[PDB]
């Protein structure tokens, strides 16, 4: 159950992340780390106030995006590896974690998204495990 | 280790981390990632069942360790940059995050510690901010 301490931790450790505000229209970015800007090639001015879906493109697996979409609807933390796109259309494997931050009332005030770029070889092992988990699940 | 979402995230992202069990004497390591073993030079046989304090040595700031000690006592998540030691006695700057993980009853069942190695130059800017925050605080308290 992560709090503002998690944002401070990601910031000081120079991680790639964004903070969104679900009380605003389309749950937009309200903060992006210098690491995120370096990873994606966007300026802060190009992404502030925008939904993170601009990272997706035609080879992104819609099943991975659906897992993120459901986690946001439910306020559930989760992680998934999926293909994302830079400002120039080049791709990277994003081992992605999303956490819902709640106030003392237990209301979700913000989401944090942490992007870790992984190698093609490692992504192939992680997406194979995800494909296997997805099948085990659709058998139960 | 766990079904805790954050532990799964740290594991899949190949981070350096440990999980402890505060229900056991001296809150020992019950899980360490391959990244932690690679960063510190320890093998699992040397660290399972041990308190993480083996990472400290003479140049570690005791004020940083005290902040971690208090966070554990209170079940508060926090981060701090402090000097830590590998098994061979060589040092590295550990930008460190600790989180308390709770069951449905809200009891702390585990702590997770996430170690990010940072450069001497970057650590110098972070510890300066810590020194400045400590003074600003003692001008209130
Ligand atoms: C904090 C946060 C971070 C996100 N980061 C990513 C990301 O790194 N990659 C990605 O493909 N989608 C990311 N998303 C997901 C999209 O913003 C979006 O929620 C998803 O595409 C589902 O919504 P849609 O169907 O309206 O596009 C993130 C969402 C949030 C709230
Ligand atoms: C999950 C967890 C991870 C820890 N990781 C570190 C670390 O990376 N570096 C460190 O110097 N101390 C770390 N500690 C702190 C020590 O284990 C210990 O709590 C601290 O030295 C204060 O207690 P003591 O006064 O009994 O030594 C960690 C503690 C826990 C519970
Ligand atoms: Na796009
Ligand atoms: Na030692």
The resolution, in angstroms to one decimal, equals 1.9
Solved with: X-ray
d(CA B40, CA B23): 25
Between chain A and chain B, the number of residue pairs with CB atoms below 8 A apart is 61
**Which H or E element spans position B29?**
strand B29-32
Rg of chain A, C-alpha, whole Å? 15
CA distance A126 to chain B (A): 8
CA distance A124 to chain B (A): 12
CA distance B5 to chain A (A): 6
Domains of chain B by start residue, with CATH: 1-141 (3.30.450.20)
Angle at the Cα of A33 from the Cα atoms of A104 and A28, rounded to 5 degrees: 60
Of B6, B97, B102, the CB nearest to A13: B97
Ligand whose nearest atom lies closest to the CA of B46: 4
Contact A78, B5 (CB under 8 A): yes
Q: Which atom of ligand 1 is nearest to the CA of A112?
A: 1
Give the Å distance between the CA of A53 and the centre of ligand 2: 39
- 3-class SS at B49? coil
- 3-class SS at B1? coil
Q: From the CB of residue B71, how many other CB atoms can be counted at a distance below 10 Å?
A: 19
Residue A53 counted as an annotated binding residue: yes
B99 vs A14: CB contact, 8 Å cut-off?
Answer: no
Contact A87, A36 (CB under 8 A): no
Contact B113, B32 (CB under 8 A): no
d(CA B75, CA B112): 11
Residues 6+ apart with CB under 8 A from B70: B76
Contact B98, B82 (CB under 8 A): no
Which residue has the CA at smallest separation from atom 17 of ligand 1? Answer: A52
Ligand whose nearest atom lies closest to the CA of B98: 2
> Which residue, B94, B101, B46, B32, is CA-closest to B72?
B101
Residues 1-40 of B with CB under 8 A from A: 5-6, 8-9, 12-14
Tell me the sheet residues that pair with A103. Answer: none
> Which residue, B54, B8, B9, B37, is CA-closest to A116?
B9
φ, ψ for residue A50 (rounded to 5)? Answer: -115, 150
């Amino acid at each position: 159950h992560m709090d503002f301490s998690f944002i401070k931790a990601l910031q000081t450790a120079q991680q790639n992340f964004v903070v969104t505000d679900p009380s605003l229209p389309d749950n937009p970015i309200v903060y992006a780390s210098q690491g995120f800007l370096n990873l994606t090639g966007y300026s802060l001015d190009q992404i502030l106030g925008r939904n993170c879906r601009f990272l997706q493109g035609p080879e992104t697996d819609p099943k991975a995006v659906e897992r993120i979409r459901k986690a946001i609807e439910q306020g559930n933390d989760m992680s998934v590896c999926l293909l994302n796109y830079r400002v120039d259309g080049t791709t990277f494997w994003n081992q992605f974690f999303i956490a819902a931050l709640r106030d003392a009332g237990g209301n979700v005030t913000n989401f944090v998204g942490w992007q870790c770029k992984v190698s093609d070889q490692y992504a192939a092992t992680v997406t194979k495990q995800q494909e296997e988990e997805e099948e085990a699940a659709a058998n139960d």
